[PDB]
Design a protein around this ligand. Structure first.
Ligand SMILES: CCCCCCCCCCCCCCCCCC(=O)OC[C@H](COP(=O)([O-])OCC(O)COP(=O)([O-])OC[C@@H](COC(=O)CCCCCCCCCCCCCCCCC)OC(=O)CCCCCCCCCCCCCCCCC)OC(=O)CCCCCCCCCCCCCCCCC
Ligand SMILES: CCCCCCCCCCCCCCCCCC(=O)OC[C@H](COP(=O)([O-])OCC(O)COP(=O)([O-])OC[C@@H](COC(=O)CCCCCCCCCCCCCCCCC)OC(=O)CCCCCCCCCCCCCCCCC)OC(=O)CCCCCCCCCCCCCCCCC
Ligand SMILES: CCCCCCCCCCCCCCCCCC(=O)OC[C@H](COP(=O)([O-])OCC[N+](C)(C)C)OC(=O)CCCCCCCCCCCCCCCCC
Ligand SMILES: CCCCCCCCCCCCCCCCCC(=O)OC[C@H](COP(=O)(O)OCCN)OC(=O)CCCCCCCCCCCCCCCCC
Ligand SMILES: CCCCCCCCCCCCCCCCCC(=O)OC[C@H](COP(=O)(O)OCCN)OC(=O)CCCCCCCCCCCCCCCCC
Ligand SMILES: CCCCCCCCCCCCCCCCCC(=O)OC[C@H](COP(=O)(O)OCCN)OC(=O)CCCCCCCCCCCCCCCCC
Ligand SMILES: CCCCCCCCCCCCCCCCCC(=O)OC[C@H](COP(=O)(O)OCCN)OC(=O)CCCCCCCCCCCCCCCCC
Ligand SMILES: CCCCCCCCCCCCCCCCCC(=O)OC[C@H](COP(=O)(O)OCCN)OC(=O)CCCCCCCCCCCCCCCCC
Ligand SMILES: CCCCCCCCCCCCCCCCCC(=O)OC[C@H](COP(=O)(O)OCCN)OC(=O)CCCCCCCCCCCCCCCCC
Lengths: 98, 83, 175, 70, 98, 96, 291, 106, 114, 347
């Protein structure tokens, strides 16, 4: 904040909703809770310039949980390859998976 | 006083609908503070278990934590049944 | 085909946006926004947002868009124009639908397209969660937290709505 | 007389009665003669989805009891 | 990112271009300003709901209240413009060129 | 009267919730065995389908951490009938 | 099997609305010391059939599309309002059934706007804008009243109103709300003294069915569901008959007076009672269960 | 699926009953009948009534979660914020009332 | 990155509790007082370890205690239990308050025979 | 307006700005902008004429567009970081959108076209709020997101603003048009130095506000809104022409007046980072501003334009306008250079 009134007065106006690892109703966790927990704890106190290089691994993991780009790429490759073999009749799904 | 009972008696005659609304809204704001049962509302909300009650690892110095759900230790809902 | 209901719903979402964005008479403009608003609620419903989706019907469609059509009827032409009868209105409609159709083609064919962001066309269900059996609605618990957690949100939101009434009475008085 | 108005009311009364009566009878016809299971929350859906697997016929309204224990 | 995001981002862009490319009726532009809000509501609700960020569940509602409050102000201005000229044409609002 | 009845309903809900709490361990245990079994099944067909792809490692994570990550719907039902995926994905949302 | 269920709901509704027209004309007649239809079929029982046939073979705009959309929207949305009604089992069991009905009811105001717009008459349009202003004004008290009632119920589920009233009808704890609710429904359906046809009369029945559920809850026995339906039907019929009764006995409001009836009497009182009903469960320790 | 089927039936049946009602009459083939700026004008009162509805409707959306809000352990805060929202809903009306926003005399 | 470790199908096998949800609901209160020890150890494992793989043995004892529990009933109290969960199964909400008589018969049965 | 309502509306204008300044959450930043815009539309219409309505509509459309882009940038940031903290943004597209949203809200070129027109269309008191108080909230956001702002974008806007503002003012005879273009040109200095030292962006904001308030206050005292009506001032209040000369020379950046101080400190901060070309170009281009300020002093203080006979009747009456803080404001606008090191209080 430009003026950090909340810390001075010790009153919380909006920090409760800034992150998703914070206290939630009925202790309901967010899907990326553990990934955001690590990145915040890694990056805490060292500054954003440092945290851009010394918490890079944690932030990549959190960004993978958030948007799941790499998981979808790996799933498309398997789907692409699988259907090809079905096109050429080399492979047949087991009893399950069908 | 009596300058006021004549004011109230005038609105009761000319605007009964508003006198009722301002009477009900005052009761709504005031009664919750003066009621002896407002505490039971907090307790009953606090007594409803939405989540699983995760057990505590028994290090060896937790005398008041029960070892079994039916043990005497721990909070009880006895007040809730009578209430 | 029902496995891509969220993608199919979002395609109609865009077409309805091309509808009123091309800007026909403000009466078909409001009809396209109603269809998109309803289709937009459908998307939110399928993600678990029952209350958020119903707030769209109750507030956005049955409140805001009603007042739009009401205001439009009081101060706008009264006579509409045959949709697409105007050259610019028709030229923008086809342009939008062509880009809407071209994005749909390359994402479904290649299961991926790249426009500013990277988009993956494996389906929307693939990112859904595989774990929940709580005996409550998480949406409802999040919204209900407004009165406990969001004391500050309520105050500023309440003040803005009171001030909206005061402001709107000043604007329209004329002296 | 007033009671000559009843026959029209009787036809309305029957008409508005059918929707509820039909729904209740169809529900029991479609659920082995029991009430249609209500699943407002994920926990109830999860138990309903487990009942479908346990049933052995892929129908959540077929119940299995101690006869499946051993 | 997922596939549905492609179209919700496509709809925001469409209504942004529709907003910035005027025609004549000032009403037709306010609807583009409300299509933008509708797209941002849906984009936010999908993000918040999918990630299970419970306390953010009220963000779309607040965003819907404030934007509608804005539209109420916008319609009021349109009505006052209509009084002065009998039409909501944007080409009648050119007094301040000099 | 409303107060007496609503108190009685809160007590019934507490009992209703408590029956769930007693059963959650047994449902949690079976959920774990179904998730792992589905993941193990997918890994087998992954090995066969991706055997001939150069540079592929079967079962490789996309995360730097070796912590357990809950799989997403795509990872679990990524190679199954559209009826089972549809029921697992939208079944609850479309019920009644 | 579901398709039969939806048909077994729509067709009785249309038949019920057709014969509501008969009941209206005979009930008004007898209150006026006459008879009403008793010539077309015995006791007039064929009068609705005669009216229907004649109407559809009678000889029959600014916007062709809107002149077609207006009847569909009103007719489609009037039928949709019935799908969540627990009678005792809903056709579609919704967790937010009450919220669904407020939403759909709100869209009903569009048909009024579109029909007035498509007319092509400046005079016709302003008449529609007056009707739209009456409706949305009185939608405010319906929503607030309904919210005050749901604080004693505990959820938005419509079948939970059955359970809420297991011991006692909500009319006793909420008769001041039931009064303003009942008048608001008349204004919402633009019925006398607030009248300043199939879809219209379907809403009238549905709003009175919803009133019986909200304030006169019928006990439901799962082993004999048909008894609930009979008692439920009787309560809604009499509530519908009271609409006819009210129409016969009163003159009409002026437009500014019915706006004043809400903005200056119902809303001030409806707001206060909303405050009262938020506080009362907390101070009495009678908050209902969330599920 | 059930809801989508129900909505489709309701609005399909409405559509059928509307088109045939537009076409069954042309069976008769009745004889041809020879029947050969942008403000209504509009009154500012019919605009204010709609806008006041909108702003009150927005403040209603804020109250809709009230049935769920009563289930929290922080009931003192919930009750204080609920009565705050309704009171300012009354304050808005009292401002409308005292500044003749709710009149119909011109 | 490394290879996601997964236990083989042989390790994931165990004798299931193949009773419907209304059967579990009817025994849930007694079940939670009889099988509490193995149940709570498994849940402490899950919350502590945050990994379904690290608690696969504890989860097998949950089934073992559950299967044994349902045999205790099948040996002494089958009919009162069958009559009870058949009443629960009728309700759409599986409500407890609708079957207080049959619940009673089941309670004296177990409180005498077990 | 009823005076009580006017005060409440002003405090809502201030409340919205403060909400943006004290918020650590992006939604509360958006809300503060939305609340702020809502309350300022009233004071723009308060005289009720077609010009005041055109200004309010052009303002509403511009600000509303900016807020939807700001919200869009906030949601993109949420998608890519899963958090709402007001700090650096975690996506370059989010940064481009936010920077353009704030640029539109400030009236920076090329998003500048509304500033001259909206300012000319409202009263002097309303224009003072538009060109002074309204800069605080967008500026305090740029202050916190600057580590992720695209340098070519922020520097491109700043240079464009210094050129557009300087050239646009040369062709103006309306005092409200002159002030608007002066505002655009001065915004260009504040954002040029932001990537290098955000403290010198606050220094230039404070001093620009103090001198802009002094100008508007002096225009309001005699109700002068055109160049030629201001040229009568010498024949009513000769003191006011001297203060107007001094303030205008200060705004031009001429030493030893206070307005030289911000330009001095920015050139120092830019050269420390080996930016030599840009500050040289910027400083030379600012000579355009000095020219059409100097023109104003010629017709006001340094010559005596022809007067009117009816001006004789004004001599018999005193000024009754409040002119609040004008004596203090004019002395901060002209005599503050010796205390330049005191800028560290803003660190
Ligand atoms: C706790 C206290 C909080 C204090 C703030 C209270 C806010 C309400 C204002 C009260 C008020 O004006 O009296 C009502 C009063 C109502 O009377 P009315 O009959 O209804 O109005 C008749 C016309 O309709 C309207 O009158 P008019 O058309 O004849 O002319 C009005 C003009 C009358 O003439 C003037 O007031 C000009 C002198 C004020 C400008 C100089 C301000 C200081 C500049 C900063 C440097 C200071 C160091 O006053 C204005 O222009 C009003 C806005 C002026 C503020 C401009 C913002 C400058 C940026 C400041 C940023 C820095 C802030 C932190 C420090 O309006 C007045 O004209 C008051 C004049 C005499 C009293 C002045 C007291 C206020 C002086 C300004 C305080 C500056 C604080 C920042 C304000 C931010 C606003 C966005
Ligand atoms: C602790 C906080 C530290 C700051 C202390 C500030 C206290 C001074 C307050 C002065 C004040 O009330 O504002 C004048 C306030 C504003 O009136 P104005 O039209 O802007 O100019 C003053 C009038 O000429 C004045 O004409 P007047 O005949 O009406 O004089 C009445 C006024 C006495 O008149 C005055 O003395 C006002 C002139 C004092 C200086 C203006 C305040 C400057 C604040 C300090 C600024 C420092 C700038 C940074 C320093 C340079 C950098 C190191 O009497 C009072 O204010 C009673 C004192 C109640 C407090 O007027 C009144 O007080 C009532 C009228
Ligand atoms: C004007 C005409 C309006 C016609 C109805 C529009 C759809 C309303 C759907 C709704 O809100 O249902 C609530 C209901 C409320 O249900 P619920 O939220 O109580 O419970 C959902 C189910 N459980 C509890 C198990 C999670 O929605 C549902 O039933 C959930 C969604 C089911 C699947 C339907 C998704 C698509 C919805 C229709 C899209 C329509 C697009 C717009 C059409 C054009 C514009 C009108
Ligand atoms: C009219 C006169 C107002 C009467 C109410 C004064 C408030 C008294 C109060 O402090 O409320 C506390 C009340 C008692 O509960 P308690 O457990 O003591 O809470 C304190 C915890 N330290 O806690 C309660 O029971 C709830 C208090 C509700 C008060 C509502 C007041 C309206 C709030 C909206 C303000 C509008 C601006
Ligand atoms: C990728 C972005 C995705 C969105 C773009 C897809 C289209 C979406 C619909 C948006 C359409 C906006 C254009 C409609 C419009 O506002 O036209 C305004 C203006 C013509 O206005 P008019 O007064 O009617 O005619 C004057 C001509 N002498 O303008 C005209 O001259 C008419 C031009 C019509 C053709 C529009 C081409 C598409 C818009 C450009 C997209 C670039 C991005
Ligand atoms: C006229 C009246 C204007 C509105 C102000 C009166 C509103 C009264 C009702 C709110 C009082 C606060 C109720 C409360 O006790 O909330 C406490 C809340 C935290 O809840 P708690 O259970 O104590 O748990 C600790 C977690 N921090 O902690 C909080 O979050 C409270 C902080 C709220 C900030 C209050 C300051 C408001 C000042 C700006 C008002 C803006 C609108 C009006 C502006 C006037 C015009 C400028
Ligand atoms: C008289 C009491 C009564 O209505 O009989 C109750 C009987 C079955 O009891 P039940 O109401 O379903 O359960 C009560 C607890 N839930 O239910 C029945 O007897 C069947 C219904 C017959 C009684 C009709 C309901 C009472 C009349 C209300 C109709 C509305 C009249 C509106 C008049 C106002 C306008 C002037
Ligand atoms: C009191 C608390 C303790 C309770 C214990 C019991 C004691 C009860 C004592 C209550 C006394 C309240 C007296 C208030 C009287 C109302 C003021 C009044 O006289 O208003 C009259 C005036 C009439 O208006 P009008 O008819 O149009 O013009 C005259 C034409 N002959 O109308 C007006 O001047 C305009 C006023 C309109 C605003 C009033 C209604 C408020 C808005 C609705 C919300 C109602 C709930 C109250 C909210 C306030 C916070 C609680
Ligand atoms: C502090 C450290 C930094 C140092 C830099 C220097 C700072 C100085 C500027 C700070 C602000 C102070 C302003 C000084 C105001 C002087 C006013 C004055 O002396 O009287 C003006 C004169 C009076 O007119 P009248 O109303 O008729 O009164 C007659 C008495 N019966 O009015 C007239 O008679 C009309 C005058 C005709 C116009 C003459 C124009 C030349 C004025 C030169 C003074 C202004 C110079 C400002 C630039 C700074 C110079 C270095």
């Amino acid at each position: 904040p430009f003026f950090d009134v909340q810390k001075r007065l010790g009153v919380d106006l909006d920090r409760w909703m800034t992150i998703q690892s914070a206290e939630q109703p009925h202790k309901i966790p967010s899907r990326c809770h553990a990934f955001e927990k690590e990145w915040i704890e890694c990056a805490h106190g060292i500054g954003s310039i440092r945290a851009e290089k010394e918490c890079k691994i944690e932030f990549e993991d959190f960004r993978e949980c958030l948007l799941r780009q790499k998981t979808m790429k790996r799933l498309h490759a398997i789907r692409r390859q699988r259907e090809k073999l079905i096109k050429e009749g080399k492979y047949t799904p087991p009893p399950h998976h069908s | 006083a009596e300058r006021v009972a004549a004011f109230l008696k005038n609105v009761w005659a000319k605007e009964p609908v508003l006198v009722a609304s301002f009477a009900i809204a005052g009761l709504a704001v005031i009664l919750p503070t003066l009621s002896p049962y407002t505490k039971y509302s907090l307790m009953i909300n606090r007594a409803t278990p939405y989540n699983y009650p995760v057990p505590l690892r028994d290090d060896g110095n937790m005398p008041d934590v029960p070892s079994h759900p039916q043990d005497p230790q721990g909070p009880s809902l006895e007040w809730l049944k009578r209430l | 085909m029902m496995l891509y209901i969220v993608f199919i719903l979002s395609v109609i979402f865009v077409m309805g946006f091309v509808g009123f964005s091309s800007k026909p008479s403000p009466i078909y403009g409001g009809l396209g926004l109603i269809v998109s608003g309803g289709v937009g609620c459908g998307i939110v419903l399928n993600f678990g947002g029952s209350f958020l989706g119903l707030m769209v019907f109750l507030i956005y469609l049955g409140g805001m868009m009603v007042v739009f059509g009401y205001t439009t009827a009081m101060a706008t032409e009264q006579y509409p124009e045959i949709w697409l009868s105007n050259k610019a209105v028709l030229g923008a409609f086809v342009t939008g639908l062509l880009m809407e159709f071209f994005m749909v083609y390359y994402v479904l064919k290649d299961k991926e397209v790249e426009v500013v962001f990277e988009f993956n066309g494996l389906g929307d269900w693939v990112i859904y969660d595989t774990g929940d059996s709580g005996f409550f609605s998480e949406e409802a618990m999040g919204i209900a937290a407004l009165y406990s957690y969001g004391t500050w949100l309520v105050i500023v939101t309440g003040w803005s709505l009171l001030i909206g009434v005061v402001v709107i009475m000043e604007i329209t008085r004329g002296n | 007389m007033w009671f000559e108005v009843l026959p029209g009311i009787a036809v309305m009364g029957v008409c508005l009665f059918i929707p509820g009566m039909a729904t209740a009878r169809i529900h029991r016809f479609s659920n082995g003669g029991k009430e249609k299971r209500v699943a407002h929350y994920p926990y109830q859906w999860y138990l309903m989805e487990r009942d479908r697997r346990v049933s052995g016929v892929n129908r959540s309204y077929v119940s299995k009891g101690l006869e499946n224990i051993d | 990112m997922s596939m549905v995001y492609m179209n919700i981002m496509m709809a925001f862009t469409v209504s942004l271009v529709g907003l910035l490319m005027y025609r004549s009726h000032l009403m037709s532009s306010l609807l583009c300003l409300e299509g933008m809000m509708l797209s941002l509501f849906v984009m936010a609700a999908l993000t918040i709901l999918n990630s299970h960020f419970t306390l953010a569940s009220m963000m779309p509602i607040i965003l819907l209240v404030f934007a509608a409050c804005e539209a109420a102000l916008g319609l009021s201005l349109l009505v006052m413009v209509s009084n002065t000229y009998g039409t909501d044409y944007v080409q009648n609002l050119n007094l301040l060129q000099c | 009267s409303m107060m007496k009845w609503n108190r009685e309903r809160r007590r019934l809900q507490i009992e209703d919730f408590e029956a769930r709490i007693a059963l959650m361990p047994l449902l949690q245990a079976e959920k774990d065995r179904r998730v792992l079994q589905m993941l193990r099944e997918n890994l087998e067909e992954e090995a066969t389908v991706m055997k001939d792809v150069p540079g592929w490692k079967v079962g490789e994570s996309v995360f730097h951490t070796t912590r357990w990550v809950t799989p997403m719907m795509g990872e679990l039902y990524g190679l199954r009938a559209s009826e089972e995926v549809l029921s697992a994905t939208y079944g609850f949302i479309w019920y009644t | 099997m579901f398709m039969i269920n939806i048909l077994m709901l729509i067709i009785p509704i249309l038949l019920a609305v057709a014969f509501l027209t008969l009941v209206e004309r005979k009930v008004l007649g007898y209150m006026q010391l006459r008879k009403g239809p008793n010539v077309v079929g015995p006791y007039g029982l064929l009068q609705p059939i005669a009216d229907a046939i004649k109407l559809f073979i009678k000889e029959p705009t600014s916007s062709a599309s809107m002149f077609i959309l207006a009847p569909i929207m009103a007719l489609g949305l009037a039928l949709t309002m019935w799908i969540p009604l627990p009678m005792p089992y809903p056709l579609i069991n919704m967790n937010l059934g009450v919220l669904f009905m407020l939403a759909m009811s709100s869209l009903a105001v569009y048909s009024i706007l579109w029909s007035g717009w498509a007319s092509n008459s400046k005079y016709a349009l302003i008449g529609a804008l007056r009707a739209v202003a009456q409706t949305i004004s009185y939608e405010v008290t319906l929503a607030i009243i309904l919210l005050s009632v749901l604080l004693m119920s505990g959820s938005f589920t419509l079948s939970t109103l059955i359970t809420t009233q297991e011991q006692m009808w909500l009319i006793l704890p909420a008769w001041p709300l039931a009064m303003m609710w009942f008048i608001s429904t008349l204004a919402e359906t633009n019925r006398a003294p607030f009248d300043l046809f199939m879809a219209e009369y379907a809403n009238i029945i549905m709003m009175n069915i919803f009133t019986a559920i909200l304030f006169l809850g019928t006990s439901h026995n799962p082993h004999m569901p048909e008894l609930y339906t009979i008692n439920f039907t009787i309560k809604s019929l009499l509530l519908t008959m009271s609409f006819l009764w009210i129409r016969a006995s009163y003159p009409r409001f002026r437009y500014d007076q019915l706006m004043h009836l809400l903005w200056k009497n119902f809303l001030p009182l409806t707001l206060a009672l909303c405050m009262w009903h938020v506080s009362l469960p907390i101070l009495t320790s009678g908050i209902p269960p969330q599920t | 699926m059930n809801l989508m089927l129900a909505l489709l039936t309701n609005f399909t049946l409405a559509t059928l009953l509307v088109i045939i009602a537009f076409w069954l009459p042309q069976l008769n083939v009745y004889s041809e009948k020879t029947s050969p700026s942008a403000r209504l004008p509009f009154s500012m009162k019919f605009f204010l009534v709609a806008i006041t509805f909108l702003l009150f409707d927005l403040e209603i959306a804020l109250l809709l979660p009230l049935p769920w809000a009563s289930q929290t352990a922080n009931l003192n805060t919930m009750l204080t914020m609920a009565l705050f929202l309704i009171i300012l809903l009354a304050v808005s009306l009292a401002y409308e009332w005292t500044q003749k926003g709710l009149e119909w005399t011109e | 990155p490394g290879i996601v470790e997964l236990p083989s199908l042989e390790d994931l096998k165990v004798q299931e509790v193949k009773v419907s949800s209304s059967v579990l609901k009817a025994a849930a209160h007694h079940y939670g007082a009889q099988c509490d020890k193995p149940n709570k150890e498994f849940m402490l494992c899950r919350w502590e370890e945050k990994d379904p793989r690290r608690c696969l043995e504890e989860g097998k004892l949950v089934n073992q205690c559950a299967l044994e529990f349902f045999r205790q009933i099948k040996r002494h109290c089958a009919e009162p239990f069958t009559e009870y969960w058949t009443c629960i199964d009728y309700s759409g909400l599986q409500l407890f308050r609708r079957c207080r008589k049959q619940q009673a018969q089941f309670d004296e049965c177990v409180l005498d025979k077990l | 307006m009823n005076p009580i309502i006017f005060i409440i509306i002003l405090l809502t204008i201030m409340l919205g700005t403060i909400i943006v300044m004290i918020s650590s959450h992006w939604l509360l930043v958006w809300i503060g902008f939305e609340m702020n815009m809502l309350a300022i539309i009233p004071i723009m219409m308060k005289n009720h004429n077609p010009r005041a309505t055109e200004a309010s509509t052009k303002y509403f459309l511009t600000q509303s567009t900016a807020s939807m882009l700001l919200m869009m940038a906030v949601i993109i940031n949420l998608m890519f970081s899963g958090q709402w903290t007001v700090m650096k943004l975690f996506n370059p597209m989010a940064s481009m959108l936010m920077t353009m949203a704030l640029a539109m809200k400030l009236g920076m070129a090329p998003f500048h076209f509304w500033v001259p027109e909206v300012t000319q269309g409202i009263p002097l008191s309303s224009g003072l709020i538009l060109l002074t108080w309204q800069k605080l909230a967008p500026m305090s956001v740029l202050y916190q997101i600057f580590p992720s702002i695209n340098l070519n974008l922020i520097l491109t806007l700043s240079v464009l603003s210094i050129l557009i503002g300087g050239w646009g003012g040369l062709n103006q005879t309306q005092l409200r048009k002159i002030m608007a273009y002066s505002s655009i040109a001065h915004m260009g200095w504040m954002t040029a130095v932001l990537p290098y030292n955000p403290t010198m962006t606050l220094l230039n904001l404070i001093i620009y506000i103090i001198m802009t308030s002094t100008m508007f206050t002096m225009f309001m005292a005699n109700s002068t809104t055109t160049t030629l009506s201001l040229s009568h001032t010498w024949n009513k209040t000769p003191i006011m022409t001297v203060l107007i000369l001094a303030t205008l020379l200060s705004m031009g950046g001429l030493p030893p007046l206070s307005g030289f101080m911000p330009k001095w400190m920015i050139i120092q901060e830019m050269t420390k980072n080996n930016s030599i070309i840009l500050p040289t170009f910027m400083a030379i281009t600012a000579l355009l501003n000095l020219y059409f300020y100097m023109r104003l002093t010629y017709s006001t203080t340094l010559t005596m334009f022809p007067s009117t006979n009816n001006m004789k009747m004004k001599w018999q009456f005193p000024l009754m306008k409040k002119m609040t803080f004008l004596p203090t404001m004019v002395v901060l606008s002209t005599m503050m250079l010796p205390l330049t090191p005191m800028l560290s209080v803003l660190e």
